[PDB]
Symmetry: D2
Subunit: 312 residues, 4 copies
């Protein structure tokens, strides 16, 4: 096909008619090189830590885009303040290999990422990173499934891209994605049944045993955030990782997990909340600050927020 | 790798020990070709039903193997009788592509197959396929996730090969696989909560709220039989697709879904029962009949089985 | 490897420390997408005109870099003046599939390219393209051989890049390349023996039968410009496609053949001449204007220029 | 493609007609695996001798085939005798990787092999390999250029398969190949001009300056035997590596270079003579002996042969 839409071309038709210098583009391009290598390594996984190496990889490519100043990793303490010579205006937040554990069982996992723009006239510090999701310029993730699909959500909406392994380019496959309004799938680890706050518990029973005599929601849960979000994004559904006492303020770190997802979600007509407040407005204080997250189709997030409101 | 132990080097080398004709090797070598092609089809089945390409593909590779004579496919009303010029001693039942609907959400999908030996002297027929799972000589499945995997269970063991895309060969990685006795995961579509029979519903409870003040089991359910079974085999645990009111005879078909996995399971030291009898011991009356299926790490399936006749 | 040098990263460390906006980079990146697709299509050539499609491809990607204004193809009459919305400052000259004929015999072929910068304050026209090689900002070519290697020569020197088919990135493999000073290979189509100008003819006899009793030069000639230049670039050697009467002013078009090569050559310490004047200083008058070209190791070009001088 | 005719589907299907044991198929299937791996090794043998990985690889695949017993490799002083546990009825001579030095310049390289049947009853030995080329039962070569090709010539024809990297299978593309009677290309290292014998040197002349006021032949010489032979087979013409003073016995070794190509040539209706006798009719005395080789479209080789005894 003589007219292929590589994501490079596509972001160049978002971040160029907008006159913004297309810095974004080189940052994104670089993320692709890293995402691609992670996919190859993972496909041949069992024939050749992976996340450390994928961390190193992401960082290196990132720096070299000459479009970053601060970087936060799940795998790193201090947010990496990019050296001066290669600086640029963006703050990138990431989980390079989400699900490192799950490779062994061959379950789809991914590289999540959040991006910010430094809102200051100074020298970078991890404070430049402590902005809330409402200030994300773009967030996305790449899933290493039966295909390697990159989902990128910028201010206009969400577009899925898939890796054509032959030409090695993320090709555009879905434009301006919008989630289903209501779903039929609730995804959550019911092993934690006992420790669930009552709001959640009433909800699970409402999905399993619908009072208003419909059919019970189908339970799903790959147990990989990337996978469950994506099934949620396309097929609709509600995904919940509320807090219990074991992980008292939840398990998913805000910064580069709850937030990038929640942004992708909201741009696609999907709510994302902690249970009290939306995940995109919490003022982030520690780069590794955790937060509960409930995302998915609006009419379900809402069917649960009512319930949460009806309990305090 | 220099002395690359291909699936074929492996199957041919063990085949030599039966002082045989070479058809197992031909069969499997040909099946492999359907698998690579399906894997490739799936890795880009979003850049622009599938079941059928996958299906026609399998029938084709298998006819030409000169090793088949009766083929039972999920997709065909009747069995397929291999033309004489090309008939051989084996009978293959297979689901060519499992969970096809699940490919939109990027769920790890697969091809499951079971191979029988035509023991009788008359014209090949369905009856030959109407053998108990116990009788199989070879089984496994090919998984299509982050990597393409082929687990093959024969008289001597269950083994795992992963396709190396660089060379288009299936290479041996896990040898003589054995499942953990007891483990921490139950896998079941909890959406059918109101449908389940008491035995199950008590067991679910026992795992979430464990009576011995222990750690509860985790919940998993990818919703693609192959991903869940492969998880159950590698990490240990239990998977269940019990009969319920929407499906009193089970959902997962016997000949091509239940019996192969069942066989692979028992060969690794797990069990697979319908709660009332071994899956492999069922004598199929119809080539398309279903079965309840509870497979996994022994002690757990057992814990269940007791609950069955603790309720009998 | 966590620190991969993709050509994107490499040109970004040439066209960024130089403050030039890295427009160049997106142009180059785009050429890579096209180059990559051509390689895939060609590898699977005999299992699926190719140059028309590769022409269309190059053009499309090119336009979309938002870095071009004029484009000249071997396969096109009127140099394509890029539409305004996607304009930029560069003029790109190219032969998308050099050797279209040779695919059938499985001989390495390539995509050559020359780049200019519009030296005017107006509306683009093919005049913007009629600059001589001395005004090329960068020239290169990609070879579709047993590997797909891109050779890129900018003002600093030449760097070879090779396609790592797994991650799909041109990885850097040779920095600041310099040709051998003297060679031992003369490459030319001696079928044309008869029509050769005497300067050339004395030279062939001097290579075959060395008067100063050394050993005869090895004759080579893949009969694909890309291939012969590249063998010339690395192993040294002299490549000659002088004019005869059949192709009286030679066969290779200046614009996107003789010139990009000659530039690559000169930046690597290799002369390139028509026989009278250097190929990089001829004022180009017709985009399809032809020119003789002799390139390669300095001490040989020179061993031949003497001879040419000694004949007029 | 659905009914993909693999090299194996092909070799197995013709093998059935000899009412055989299945070793040709095993042999070739195993050889294929060495080829893919070498192709892959070459496609990235610049991102960081080779002969040896390639070599060890071939010996390995072939021992394990359970089809060999004597193996004659370019690289080993002595023949390799397959251990009894693994011996079978075939003898394979092969150059594992040809023109290794030519990989730096990206020259299309290849693996050439010839297979014999051990007819005698004693312990396998060199003598078995000391058979005339006429006696071969199977031959061909695998080319590694823009695409990886496997030409296989057996009793019934010469056929061409191209490796489809997407599936890791060699697929049949050209069927029952036949060379053109006469054609327009001579191929020879003209660097040895002062070394050649009169017969050749007159013939060269006759083609450059054709006496019948005709179109001269074109000159080609990639300098990698496989590329030139494959060209000669597909497009017609002549290739020559005549004996000269630097090499009076020819350069190209007989058993593994000359005889296979020779066989492939004659099977397509070309000829291959040393100028004094058919290449295939030579009875090798040493497994490493060389031969003069002139192969190609009949009429031309003939035109030469006459010149031989027009000079006798
Ligand atoms: Tl992680
Ligand atoms: Tl994480
Ligand atoms: Tl997490
Ligand atoms: Tl299916
Ligand atoms: Tl199924
Ligand atoms: Tl099923
Ligand atoms: Tl061309
Ligand atoms: Tl050209
Ligand atoms: Tl040309
Ligand atoms: Tl060699
Ligand atoms: Tl050789
Ligand atoms: Tl040779």
């Amino acid at each position: 096909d003589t007219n292929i839409v590589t994501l490079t071309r596509f972001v160049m038709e978002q971040g160029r008619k907008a006159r913004g210098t297309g810095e974004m583009t080189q940052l994104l391009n670089s993320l692709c090189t890293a995402v691609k290598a992670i996919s190859t390594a993972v496909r041949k996984a069992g024939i050749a830590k992976l996340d450390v190496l994928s961390n190193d990889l992401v960082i290196n490519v990132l720096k070299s885009s000459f479009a970053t100043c601060v970087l936060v990793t799940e795998e790193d303490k201090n947010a990496i303040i990019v050296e001066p010579e290669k600086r640029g205006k963006y703050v990138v937040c990431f989980d390079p290999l989400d699900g490192s554990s799950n490779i062994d069982c061959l379950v789809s996992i991914g590289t999540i990422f959040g991006i910010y723009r430094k809102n200051s006239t100074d020298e970078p510090s991890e404070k430049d990173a402590l902005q809330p999701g409402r200030n994300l310029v773009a967030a996305g993730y790449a899933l290493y499934g039966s295909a390697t699909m990159l989902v990128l959500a910028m201010v206009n909406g969400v577009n899925c891209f898939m890796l054509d392994p032959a030409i090695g380019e993320f090709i555009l496959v879905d434009r301006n994605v919008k989630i289903k309004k209501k779903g039929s799938i609730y995804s959550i680890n019911e092993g934690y049944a006992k420790e669930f706050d009552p709001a959640i518990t009433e909800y699970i029973q409402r999905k399993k045993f619908p009072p208003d005599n419909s059919a019970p929601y189908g339970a799903r849960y790959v147990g990989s955030m990337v996978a469950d979000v994506h099934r949620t994004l396309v097929y609709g559904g509600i995904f919940m990782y509320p807090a219990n006492k074991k992980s008292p303020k939840g398990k998913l770190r805000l910064l580069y997990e709850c937030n990038p997802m929640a942004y992708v979600m909201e741009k696609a007509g999907g709510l994302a909340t902690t249970g009290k407040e939306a995940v995109l407005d919490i003022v982030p204080t520690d780069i590794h600050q955790r937060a509960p997250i409930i995302l998915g189709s609006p009419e379900d997030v809402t069917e649960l927020l009512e319930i949460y409101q009806k309990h305090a």
